Amino acid sequence: AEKLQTTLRVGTYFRAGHVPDGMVLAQGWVTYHGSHSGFRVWSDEQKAGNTPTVLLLSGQQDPRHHIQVRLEGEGWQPDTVSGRGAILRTAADNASFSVVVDGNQEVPADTWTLDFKACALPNSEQQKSVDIVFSS
């Protein structure tokens, strides 16, 4: 019996300060070796009902600290049907996506929780959580 597996790997030496759009902060993976037509990944931190791939994270030390990121990857499309997250149509057992800075930002020193959930086309195997640390 095959299970859908997820992993999430975060970069490591991030400096608080000016951050450019496109800077990769984390990479995610989804795995499912059963029969499927694609993968869907979304997050509860999605910014607004009209931005399926854009997330807004709040700081642990100060919730007023925000960082805005987007889900990205070759082949991933915004899920316009559900309006939540990104969709990739593939029979491949493995898929991967990036979480990147969305818009030039002044990121303060704090820690942010990055959560995402994945579906093969949620239990404790379909979701993952990491902390993103920006230091001064």
Numbering used by the authors: 30 to 150, 164 to 178
From the paper:
Saf pili are often found in clinical isolates of Salmonella enterica. The saf operon is located on Salmonella enterica centisome seven genomic island, which consists of four contiguous genes encoding the major subunit (SafA), periplasmic chaperone (SafB), outer membrane usher (SafC) and minor subunit (SafD). Saf pili are assembled by the chaperone-usher (CU) secretion pathway. In the DSE step of Saf pili assembly, the N-terminal extension (Nte) of an incoming SafA replaces the chaperone G1 strand (in SafB) via a zip-in-zip-out mechanism, giving rise to a remarkable polymer of SafD-(SafA)n (n > 100).
